[PDB]
Amino acid sequence: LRAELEQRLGALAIRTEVVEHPTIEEMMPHIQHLKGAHSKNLFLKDKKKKNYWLVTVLHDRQINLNDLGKQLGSGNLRFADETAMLEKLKVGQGCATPLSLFCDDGDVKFVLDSAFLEGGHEKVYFHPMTNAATMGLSPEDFLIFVKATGHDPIILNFD
């Protein structure tokens, strides 16, 4: 649940900023404080090796699946069934992917776009294991968090 995520962030001394989702007027009042780097999250699986892994890239990143597989593992990477994501990361249709990987210990690798750590954006935004809000936090503290969950990420650059 989200409470466990906030509890582990407080244990790691990571201060965040959460804007609660429920009309362009509310989104305009909340948009003024929301300014940073958003993301699109992919949960992929290798047919051959039968290992699930997680990819987090920028929201506007154009991406080819077979080319991404070629960078890591010929296109053998396919999208993973939502049942797998539900049983592995306790979420479904809510891709709170960096904030929900604290459950999987060694069965899900983490791929992160390099542009989240480089660039002039003060905070990055992800869901806190629910679609009813968005949590924003510093990219370096976010890297500290994802490394504290046992997932040494594999940073790769697209530019």
Side-chain angles (χ1 to χ4, degrees), residues 12-22:
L12 294 176
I14 294 182
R15 52 197 307 266
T16 65
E17 315 165 81
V18 200
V19 46
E20 227 72 29
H21 293 306

Side-chain angles (χ1 to χ4, degrees), residues 105-122:
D105 307 73
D107 304 331
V108 164
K109 276 84 160 171
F110 191 36
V111 186
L112 175 62
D113 182 321
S114 71
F116 288 103
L117 310 178
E118 60 196 24
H121 37 264
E122 212 79 33

Side-chain angles (χ1 to χ4, degrees), residues 16-22 29 36-158:
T16 65
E17 315 165 81
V18 200
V19 46
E20 227 72 29
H21 293 306
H38 296 69
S39 57
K40 62 173 35 182
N41 312 111
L42 302 178
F43 194 126
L44 305 180
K45 175 205 187 180
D46 200 271
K47 309 190 88 163
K48 283 183 168 180
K49 293 176 181 172
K50 295 199 181 184
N51 220 340
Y52 302 109
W53 53 16
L54 190 56
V55 180
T56 299
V57 302
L58 275 62
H59 67 276
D60 59 73
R61 264 276 179 259
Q62 66 282 2
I63 172 176
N64 284 355
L65 205 56
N66 314 279
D67 295 8
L68 174 72
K70 191 182 284 180
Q71 293 182 349
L72 289 302
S74 187
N76 299 295
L77 251 62
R78 169 201 167 96
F79 269 71
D81 316 317
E82 289 96 308
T83 323
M85 190 187 41
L86 202 293
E87 67 180 352
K88 288 299 191 179
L89 296 188
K90 315 162 309 307
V91 295
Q93 278 52 224
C95 294
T97 56
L99 306 191
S100 170
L101 41 72
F102 62 57
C103 177
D104 188 295
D105 307 73
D107 304 331
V108 164
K109 276 84 160 171
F110 191 36
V111 186
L112 175 62
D113 182 321
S114 71
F116 288 103
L117 310 178
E118 60 196 24
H121 37 264
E122 212 79 33
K123 293 103 179 188
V124 301
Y125 299 92
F126 300 108
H127 292 267
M129 293 186 57
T130 178
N131 301 304
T134 43
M135 179 178 276
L137 40 73
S138 171
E140 301 81 2
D141 294 55
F142 150 76
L143 184 62
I144 295 177
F145 169 79
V146 292
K147 298 187 70 174
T149 65
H151 308 69
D152 297 354
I154 38 174
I155 295 92
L156 49 79
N157 201 335
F158 299 80

